[PDB]
Amino acid sequence: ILGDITSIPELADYIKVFKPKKLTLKGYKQYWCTFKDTSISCYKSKEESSGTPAHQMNLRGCEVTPDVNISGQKFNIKLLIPVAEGMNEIWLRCDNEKQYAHWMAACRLASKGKTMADSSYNLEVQNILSFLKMQ
Numbered sequence: 047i048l049g050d051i052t053s054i055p056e057l058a059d060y061i062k063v064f065k066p067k068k069l070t071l072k073g074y075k076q077y078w079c080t081f082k083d084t085s086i087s088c089y090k091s092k093e094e095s096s097g098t099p100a101h102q103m104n105l106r107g108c109e110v111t112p113d114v115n116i117s118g119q120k121f122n123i124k125l126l127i128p129v130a131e132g133m134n135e136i137w138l139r140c141d142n143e144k145q146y147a148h149w150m151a152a153c154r155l156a157s158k159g160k161t162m163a164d165s166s167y168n169l170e171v172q173n174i175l176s177f178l179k180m181q
Contacts, residue, residue: 055162057081062139074139084156103127105156121146147174
């Protein structure tokens with residue numbers, strides 16, 4: 047208290063999420079998403095984020111893979127998430143380098159059971175940004 051979302055810290059932003067499903071045509075859908083503790087919640091809009099998420103995932107133990115091309119302005123994150131009887135595959139698509147650095151760093155820490163309050167959070171964010179530049 048005496049703080050906002052950055053005091054926690056958490057993320058809350060518009061993120062595109064591609065979640066393929068059997069016999070279903072799916073794409074990168076824009077959701078209003080939060081990153082809290084080790085979990086991502088996806089909502090249809092900011093206006094519907096008090097209710098049940100359109101998607102929710104706890105990233106503990108997940109595999110996080112960068113899918114980046116700077117020239118193409120492609121800032122994607124692939125997630126493979128272990129569930130009680132299976133693994134779940136999701137792609138996050140970010141709008142720019144800074145959004146990508148923050149979400150990708152959050153995913154990596156969450157995979158390892160860490161929240162963004164961990165000292166390694168800003169290590170991951172800044173080093174991602176450092177390597178998104180051109181020589």
